[model samples]
Target chain A: EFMAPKVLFIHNEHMCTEAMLGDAFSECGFDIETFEVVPPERVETPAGDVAFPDPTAYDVIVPLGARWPVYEQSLVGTWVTAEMDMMRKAADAGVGILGVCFGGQLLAQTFGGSVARAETAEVGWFELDTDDAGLIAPGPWFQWHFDRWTVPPGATEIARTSRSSQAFVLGRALALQFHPEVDVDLLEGWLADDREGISGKLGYNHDDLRLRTKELVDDAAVRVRELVRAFLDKVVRADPAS
Target chain B: EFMAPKVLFIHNEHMCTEAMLGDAFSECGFDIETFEVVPPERVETPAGDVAFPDPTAYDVIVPLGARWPVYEQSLVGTWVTAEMDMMRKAADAGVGILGVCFGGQLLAQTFGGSVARAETAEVGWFELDTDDAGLIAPGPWFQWHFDRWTVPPGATEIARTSRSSQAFVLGRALALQFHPEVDVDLLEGWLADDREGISGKLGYNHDDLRLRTKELVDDAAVRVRELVRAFLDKVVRADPAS
Candidate 1:
């Protein structure tokens, strides 16, 4: 019997990447479980769950998006600090952490980095300038976050897009601003949550978004594969054979 | 039962309604606070800080314009579930939830409905079709969510515009898709979060959004006051004889 890869997922937002993100980890032969942020009354939430797993014990950890801000030592900030400490310990012990959106913000903040909403938000669609494309690669990137993060100290720049901290590598610890795990159909499904209101507020009809989304779907899928490989290679060092 | 009006504020995205939403509740005499889909590892997360009267104990729930999604069951979905379970329980016990943007999606899902993104997205100044708005009037409305929700089962349709579901009352719950809680600072905060990168993909450039948002601010602010009256008069059921 194949052993399930051990993974820990840190839950954040209402509509998080459990099935989608968890499926990605599952493909790698990992047994995935979620530590949901919901209150105790709900069974799915980690509210009354047992003690949190040691980040070092898991092969990797992932945190999703949320409305909770990641500044100061406020309620949400404190949670981020503790998790980062675990990630820091896990990194030293050889564990991979993939932070998405607000998750990425948490990683940056935990590592002494900073995060704040860009003067302009990136709610529905926008293009990213991957300036480090030669090193980081350029292309129009997909996004759904309103905030941006500065690369943490000591992390090597893997990618830098126009509006966000695309990917910053620090040893096996990889922090991703964009979610390589999100598939296009998933993106469409996710985006389905808001289309018209987005058009009305942002002030544009969706003629282009529809066409571009269709065009980028396949390429983005390929990009996600490459990103996952790159992250695994750089962050997940020591092969199983070793 | 001197009925202390406790509020279950969904706190995943730091967008519109943070200020005015709370004020709407406070001015009515109840206390205010926030909840998130953040897991314990995130630290500082209000996931388990059941301070006074448990969150469910609240007489009403106010979901600010969500930056979080409800289409997918992601961590952000944790906010959705938390909100849903809370709202369902609250409504069963006869409570109300004031929803907008993402919050509307939560209500749509809670009472048994669907939340999906539109073929196009809406952002800034747009007309809110008020043909369906009974007491909840509509005009050119302010919106930021990319997602939209339909009325759930056992809910009364109070309002709808040609564009989307404007307002509905389920039991004691008053759910509105249009935002009455919008304030400039909140608008600035959300505009900062939504307008970025890959413009034209989903339509609406950053400037377009900024200009329209300004136009909507004054008129919409007035609407928010009126909407709050519905909560004070229709939902909260204060009946102040003290």
Candidate 2:
């Protein structure tokens, strides 16, 4: 009997690997394991020390999206550097990386790229100009980011908008700048944790956004599944040795 | 019977595909076809009108290194833009590109990257710091170039030296900053065409360089063959639809 491929999901503070993403990976026969970087108690201050698991132990290392910018070491603490180092080691070891949003920015920064605040923050649903439609659909994917990443050296930009590069592929890694993993429950969690009043500051109605997410949740789930399928087929399966 | 994969060799002026590169491709079952961008007569002043073939017609496009910089549109003429456009179309159409030095620069420029003069031009054989030694060997690869390339957005930097990024992979395209196609005969041709006194300017002894090349020719041949094998297996075979 063949062993199922394993995926290590690195979850940030409040952003646990829930909803469509976990479902998709499970459906794709990945023995999924979650590692929370910041504990719930430390979410407010976010200066707690955390130990990251050996990424090479798993077939794939997935760094999911985070609320904090990857560059702000002061805000996120020294664990950020440790996590980046872990990801770098993982990449060198030929383990596949599937980075999302802040996770994608981490991949870029961990490689030879930079991330900075965008001129205009992208919030809510948005469509992207994708080069490979079959691999990455021209999604009205969920977006909630203030910073944008420059594509790392030797990565292919597959999807993008005029404001920022949305997606890229490098060897066995796939970095997605948008959140394909978002669902109504995930959004509610984010909304509950909006102590900074981001929605109000951005002139967005929380009730309206929640209702819109409810309407789009089913379709988004399907898109997330397709995205996972593509990631597995194109990235993980691309190199058998990996 | 299965049809052998076809590779289009885009030869720059005076740099014909007549070395271990061709032999390796042939050995790996690639039906090779050569296309010269600048005619023999226009070698001195390469501003003559030339037509580039549709790149998607072939399975792979190998743009060999050139004598001139790819960014000098005025010197190289409008055809440079045309060729870049053709490469863009080919990449979008999923045709694999194996680009050498100047060819690699073209790939960078064709994508969202830039190319410019290096602080110190690498002119002799040198070893590189390669991330993946399996895919790219840490070789004392032949180097004879003035300019260097910035890795394109959405590409992965697989090999490099402190001076420049040596190699990058974007989707099905592999851009190499070093000349893996160089041999003794090819060097002799370059020496004969040194009317510009590049060798003298760089304080390089042509006789010593020639003798050194002759000694290393056998090993270099093996390296080039391995590079071609890796490109075929890693890049080409990675995507069945491509």
Candidate 3:
């Protein structure tokens, strides 16, 4: 039993934030564990697969960005039901949870909030026109999701751009339309997976977007650090009305 | 040798932040070592002690709160000279150092700044009238000192109240007049050491302060965590001018 205010990270397939938030949280003296809802292709699934650990055991639950949308439960498989239950239990227990991209849509689908298919997917760098500038800064934050979540019930929609609700906070949980966790390596993995489709969606060439991402590496680190700090202080730790 | 960023804690007799900043820093993945400049009665000083370790070896040097003022060379003994030299070397090395209370006074005196005997001592919970309230808030923060430090050169005085300079930042280092690290247990140790003198100085009953402290245990935990976050983000990690 890890006793250090542990965070259970629900990693769905090839979408793991890895050191993105793990480093930030550990820096604050919190422990983190990753559990794949669906195993990564590179690794063998452990015996008695999908044992489904209790989300209440962790102080936080992070269902990071995923390759598939919440509506595509057929692709996500039966694990989707158990994961929703785990998130509900964790949310009820007052454990902090952060949902990124596909995970954000999942939260909307789980709660009363609904997920909507976008007319044109947001798939590359876009500056946010935030409601609260401090809460979600005007970041050229990375974006790749094809669907947008309708803001969850009881959650304040703190940020949004032209496309959809960029962020929302419900109790101790936060959901983001954008991926603040994306580093060069993580982006490279995504690019390698769907370079043609993603690059075409951006209305730009693959190498051009890649070069832009490379340029933003140092700035991205600073932005993500700030975003995590804000999420912890303003959403996770703050009282609902506050 | 600890692989993590090591902090050499110069702990004075009857004085230590204990696990206050230790727990906070550890949460952020830092290593801490207690090197007693003077030993408390409960502890044994190692043989050939005060053979001061090279401060540059550590990532940070913490000259924690002390019972003796920086001017008290007689009480501080011959170790004071070496401690000053160690701090100077550490400062030049660009290692982050946090100076708290008596430690803060020592930093001031070690640099171009000086310490002075106060006309009025601040010995209990007092609200801060800070220049930047965001950096150092109006905590009923614990205080017990009869001396004050002049703002050191190459440092920006970030905070102050009527009684003294509450906080300052010099390069990769920070200094504080108040003890954000004082939990109830640590306060109890101080009270046990000199209940009569301390209570008399505060112009309050000892038991009342003790009871008040007990009530504030939960609140103190929250405050100290926030304080440490601010120190790391705004002071230690911030650019020197920032």
Candidate 4:
């Protein structure tokens, strides 16, 4: 009776977790469980107490992106602080961590780095400049961010754009700025719930974005699958920090 | 009987009109009349019919920034089309037009140019690279925009950044990407009504922004005064198109 490696996903409010990335993990014989931090009712006015599940119970912890900023304690309530603490605790407990976008920013902040508004918001697909193509593929990745994070102390930056850090790794923790998990379904869900019409205000054509997603999704799926395998093989199971 | 030169301000919904700008116009002895396009009640759900005042009646027409984009008919309603028509009419009638930020994007779009999302969002004080210092002073102007516009077919770009067009002039019309009309009151008002917490989500410290505004507002007031005078002398009252 062998037990499968368990992966815990800390899914933030109003965001999808492991769209294409989950397939890769599933293929690797990993059992997945999800913990939703903010409930559906509290999505609008997200000011409440949130108890994050313990990270030591999982083989790997994946913290996904959120609409909220990690720095703004007043706006995001005290959960951001608690969430950071949980991530730090996970790092100390030697659990492998994979952070995406906001989650990446959180990891950066938790590990002696900083997150702030970028000089410009990156809303479209962009190609990256990567040092190690084997570990992190040079991707024309889906990006929609107003914030950028610095690489945490002791972390090695693996990929980047001229404007911001794209990917970095610190021991068992892999932090990615661009979304490898975003599929057409996830993109459509985000666009559909854009009640404030932010995409429109930013001059993004919803039709065009949807069409682009359709065209790029298959290629993106391949890239993400490769990325997850690379993460598991290279970052997660490779080493213990001296 | 001598009639004072009338300046019509097309004030968009949920935005302040003529904060520091009105004072400059007043100093030049212009009679100011504001026409609110979107009513206060319709700020949130802004899809409704709006009738713009006749632009030809005023000596100058100033269209201010809006929360809405010039494109996206469904989001901003059909009023965007009608408003653009009004602006065209104003330009055709030889009425001096001063366009600010979103208003500037509108002018560019109306005059055979395009507006789209920038590679990044610029949301703080920034210095400009200007061709004509007399016309547009190169100072750290306050910028808070997600979209960038191209120079219109016949317009001359006077100021710019590496990322986007900053200022352009065509006959009696001048378009500015940065805000010269933003005073402490205006900035404070914007922050106060930030229901979505966009600034915070972008990792902006509200206190830092406020303090920066306080330090720069006086110099900005001076720059705006000079800019208004230059517009009046060079664009508005200069000459007719051949």
Candidate 5:
């Protein structure tokens, strides 16, 4: 018997997303399995078979982000749409879904809001405003989306940033628009390796990326981990059937 | 060294989507990977996992789906928004996308369509009205959706259903609001599975479910297999960097 706490982590985009999640979830002693949302040949980031098992086999479902924006419809071909449908079906059936960034946007699309460009890119650190439903706070959070969102109809707002949606609570799910998992490796990778090169693609400069290197990555990760633990142990825990 | 041609196989509401892709893509003997967006433990269903490496490492992208609708903003939430963002990123980057039904609906949502409850769900096989794009309507398609989509602002209508948008073409992408990849097992599992049993929740009955199932599911798989083969070997096979 695979006694490990099984999890289905969707999307090849989440390789970096997994690096963020694996460390965090593994701390909680959950066995994580990641799978690409696209086909085998379509991947451009990591190589080889994804170790993550299916979500239904797992106790939790965590969907993370990508360099891709969540709102582009054509962007979500058959593969992405089916993935979202399964996410929706799973959540509706009671699987705990923690959607981060693009994953969060998928939850929103599953419930309602389709992705759209934000008024301004919340590229760096920003403060969030928390509400009763939101376990996460509204302050000094890492930002990385040109697109932000509005919470799904049935969900509760947990946190908010200046540009757009920060976090929301929907039944057994927590949707995060920022990278609370950001740590030294992620920040450094973006800042040093792909930062200068990629920012130009977004019409941003290295300085803008540098300006985003706030001191909150680890702290934010800590806060989010607590929040995730709470959601897993509290919110979703409230319903064992979930 | 790791070979190229990474694929992303999404966990759709039904297994049919990825199975078809696998059956087709495997013909070239390309090392393909599958990722279930929806894991079985998370789902009330029995979807399994097929692994793929990472997303950023892929050379091309192909996403498939059925009835992954993106409702209006009024019903937006964290997941929806996040997914939309990712889809946009993939599309904008000129990644090739093949969207079906729910996937197509999401595509329209990404391109600026209004995803909303349809006047009536398209549940049986139907012919797609092919526009100049000719991406669909070469034959009838498998159908099932309770929602309809508006054409995205910048895309061209490739196909249309009796009640709504059928398919569309937008820069390097094709989205069909019907299932070319639908197969029998998908229909069987959909009806026998838990979530699919929620027919009454959606104002449907078992008889209606039966009625809606395209009688052609078994027949379509072969046709769809051919299509998937053409796509994987043609559309998704990217030229390596010289």
Candidate 6:
């Protein structure tokens, strides 16, 4: 009997679908299983369905984005610190982690980097200085985060914009500031929930943002595919004997 | 009809040919033209055969390795400064410059970085911490150098070992401290030319080194291919505008 490599998704939102990443990993013959710690409509939630299982049980651990600020430790509650510890344990055990948005900030903080409030929150599509154009293409990958992660000691920042660290690689983990896995529906939900913030706070017209978000969907999926494959080749499947 | 890109080789020695780079670039469809600066018997020669032509004429400029130290400005005669000026001009002009070994040290020295004698010299094949595994694999790449270069200001040091910076990317240029293009024949030439140094300074038996060199040939070819392609994708065709 052949057992396929398992992938654990640390779900921060209830509606957070596998989205583009599901397609990306599916192409690579891997499927996702969720561990919903803090789903939507919750201040704090205990590790449900799985009692903080050893990260090595899965081949890859993806700590998905959260609505709360990583720096606001008071709002993070007890579950956030536990999540950080799990990530550290996984990193030490050689599990490839793809930290996305809030998860990216968490990983950065866990690994000696700082998460601080950006003067202007990057809440829409924007281009970045992606050293290798293909590695982290300035795809305008869905950017709805409010904080910046300072590049840590062991990590090398691969992509960046004026406001924040776009992407970085550290040990067996790859942290991304943009939400590559974000689908159009997910984005629509957020915009619908906060029309005033989307229109006024982020300084974007709602309909114009909706159309552009839809336009970026297919291209964003391709970018997500390439990003994950690069991660697999460079981090996950690296040094097989190890 | 599609024409291959012209790659100018800043030849440091009379014996310099494309070597492994020729094979790698040939695969990518690029022709080589040499600008021999310092030949075998000369003290210090100016840019001969071509009197410092416009770097924009070629798609890429590859400065080959040299026996001479990059920091010894006095020994380099008046031609050294001209070479530095040409390199800076090329970098600004968006010509992809892949500098190797002594050439790498030269690029660093030219671009605000300093070169100094290392406490320990790196000779023979050695593996390095290549931040991204596939980008710059843990290569037992052919290394025969005595000095180290501090990674320049605008450059990101991608790979390194204890003794020196292994690889870096600055703007549209990539610099490597090891001789990725060296074939067994070329290595044999260096060993035969300086048997005393090969034995005493490098601490290796002649025949043993020869056998190791032979063993590394095929795998090194693959590594060289990956390296140059990555450089082209990352540094050369980095962006359309610059």
In order, the candidates keep a fraction of the true contacts of 0.00, 0.00, 0.00, 0.00, 0.03, 0.00
lDDT of 4 by residue, A30-79 (tens): 99988988777777767556898999999889989877765453422357
- Cα deviation in Å at residue A4, candidate 5? 4.6
> Compared with the true structure, what per-residue lDDT tens digits does model 5 show for residues B101-186?
66666666676555655445666567666654222435666676766665665566765655767866666556667666555566
Report the TM-score of candidate 1, chain A only: 0.76
User: Model 1, which residues run further than 4 Å from truth?
Assistant: A1-242, B1-4, B38-53, B76-79, B131-134, B195-201, B236-242
Candidate 1's residue-wise lDDT over B1-242, tens digit each?
58666777765454443576667667767777776544334423422222222445676777655454553323222334445556656666666667766676667665545555554566656566453443577666666556556566556677665556667766566777766666667656655655463264666666676677677777776666667766567755632110
- What ranking emerges by DockQ with the best candidate at the front? 5, 1, 2, 4, 6, 3
Task: For all candidates, state DockQ relative to the true structure.
Answer: 0.02, 0.02, 0.01, 0.01, 0.05, 0.01
- lDDT (Cα, tens digit) per residue for candidate 1, span A1-242: 87656888887655556545666566667787778654434423322223346776687788776544554224333455666676677777777777777787777666645454443355444445553443234545556665666565556556655444667666666666665555556556555666455455564334555666677766665555555555565567733110
Q: Per-residue lDDT of A1-242 in model 5, one digit per residue for the tens?
A: 65867666776373345655666777777877777664435545322222334456667787877766554444443344555667766776678888888888877766765466677887667787777434675557677787766665666777786568788777787788887777666666656646445647765665655655545555766776676667677656544221
Clashes of 4: 4
Fraction of the native A-B contacts that model 4 recovers: 0.00
Question: Per-residue lDDT for B167-209 in model 2, tens only?
Answer: 9988888999888888988888888877766557765868877
**How many backbone overlaps does candidate 6 show?**
0
Model 6's C-alpha root-mean-square deviation from the true structure amounts to 22.0
Q: Which candidate should be chosen as best, given DockQ against the real structure?
A: 5
**TM-score for each prediction?**
0.45, 0.50, 0.46, 0.52, 0.49, 0.48
* Candidate 5 interface RMSD to the true structure: 6.8
lDDT of 4: 0.80
Q: What stretches of model 4 exceed 4 Å from their correct place?
A: A1-242, B75-77, B196-199, B238-242
Better of 2 and 4 by lDDT: 4
Residue clash pairs of candidate 2:
A154-B155, A154-B156, A155-B154, A155-B155, A155-B156, A156-B154, A156-B155, A157-B154
Sort every candidate by lDDT, greatest first.
4, 2, 6, 3, 5, 1
Model 2 ranges with Cα > 4 A deviation = A1-242, B16-18, B75-77, B238-242
lDDT by residue for model 3 (A65-111), tens: 77654654243345666677777887877788888887876776566
Native-to-model Cα distance after best TM-score fit, residue A196 in candidate 5, in Å: 6.3
**lDDT by residue for model 6 over B49-74, one digit each (tens)?**
33466788999998888876665534
